[PDB]
Nucleic acid binder design. Sequence first.
DNA 1: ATAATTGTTGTTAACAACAAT
DNA 2: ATAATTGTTGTTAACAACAAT
Lengths: 145, 145, 145, 145
Amino acid sequence: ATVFKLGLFKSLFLCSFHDITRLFKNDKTTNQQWVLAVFGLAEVFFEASFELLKKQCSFLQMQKRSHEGGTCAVYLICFNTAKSRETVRNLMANMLNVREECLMLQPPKIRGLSAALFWFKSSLSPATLKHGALPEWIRAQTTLN
Amino acid sequence: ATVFKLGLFKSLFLCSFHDITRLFKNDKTTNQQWVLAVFGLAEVFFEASFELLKKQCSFLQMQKRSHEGGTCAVYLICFNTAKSRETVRNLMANMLNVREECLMLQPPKIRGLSAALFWFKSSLSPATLKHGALPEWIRAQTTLN
Amino acid sequence: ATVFKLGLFKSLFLCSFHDITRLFKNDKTTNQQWVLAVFGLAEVFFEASFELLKKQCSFLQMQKRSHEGGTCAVYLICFNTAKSRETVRNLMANMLNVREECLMLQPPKIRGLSAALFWFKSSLSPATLKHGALPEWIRAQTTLN
Amino acid sequence: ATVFKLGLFKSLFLCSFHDITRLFKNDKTTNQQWVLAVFGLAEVFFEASFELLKKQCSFLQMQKRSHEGGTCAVYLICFNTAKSRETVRNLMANMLNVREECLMLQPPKIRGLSAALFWFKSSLSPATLKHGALPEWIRAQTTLN
DNA sequence: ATAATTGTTGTTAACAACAAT
DNA sequence: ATAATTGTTGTTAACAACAAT
């Protein structure tokens, strides 16, 4: 089913989900930073999720896009505390009110400019809900050294 | 300040919170049905909680009132599972995004036409959230038999 | 839906379920002795249930009957330990593998000869799985004083 | 007597129990997938457990062998929920109706064609209970890719 | 006076969190 | 050397059990 999640992400964000994240083949592996793509997200929840995640993220950047074929939202989360994909998954599958199957979770791609610019580009749009000091790895890669 | 609540609730709904709830002097005492009074509830979170609770309630009724003195909402919850105030306090605190301090929890006053009518009347405004088969106790005491 | 459970019990056992049990209007009320009518019971489970309940009943009498219109089984359980309808319900809904809705639980009718004879009559058939010393109240009422 | 088990299992299945399970030295360590070796299992309870587990497993495979030396069954369980041996020990003990002593529990040996084939071979006898989508790990290691 | 009703207290699955390689 | 992997340990919903009227 990923085939679709992925395909929809592309047509919606003009780039592969892979392009912005690095792989974690184990669901039990704990991490602080996470990239989340949510399909079929309800406006109200998306709104809530923001206010809610603030309470436990050093940084958080939420973005939602959509059209007739589908709707998707990407989250660049930075939990104050390391979380496994499971934990993150469980937590979010609920906070957002979508079956787990409507989620895509992989740790961000840090070393990579194409990637850094994705987050930077986003942060430029107003619609994007932002909270926190733009992460180190993104600036360090998108600044005139 | 519980008094300032009761008062506010009274001020807002026009009848002591006591007139619709039966005493439970133990936070560890579990029950399926509960009556919730929430104070300072964010518009969004109210809307959210409703869609979210549906996943775990057999019956749910929500009303929210306010004015230039404060905002307060009421819940008549019938959890599919029994839960101690301890639990509901936790669940609803984080769900509504408020301090445990902003919540009043006691099981409904099931036997007593007056109260039983409260929900009836409430179930008459379109600006109210309904869900599930209206409770036997509430139904009986308010229909010609 | 009880209407059916009941109706099926009759056509299957030639008597009302009420005829053999006394009412408990509260599900949280604990009791040792229980009468159970299970609809849609699977042979294998019915068999198992026997062996399983033995481990925790001073007495137990199981009986299963059926036909095209439906199938039903009655249990006269005597838990070594007092159990609420809930507890009993939860326990059995699972041990038997039927939704709760396929259960009927009420404490037996002790003072009553028509009732005593039901259990006695049953215990006379071979098919009936029996375990334990026939309860006091049944003998005391079905013996030549 | 664990040795008498292993031996019996070996005697019964023709290959060390070790050849299909990965070490977990902590009963409190939780996991979704488990391999169960049960000894002295009542015909009925085996049949029952299968229909019963289906309610809580994404994949399940059961085989039961015996001779004039003893009886032993094997389970490849993939619980929808993670469970420590502690838990499964309890759950399966009471479900199969045997002392904790009659159970051997270790997570499967997922990486290793040999073992991976065990289930494959096993999935070739009609006298075996199947349920759900055969596991990625088992599938991969045994199909032309 | 049977039960309806809460107290009140253990036990334990379902998890998060994190040490440790 | 990143993660994949279990240890290992709290916290707490989901309950049974039972005191008490």
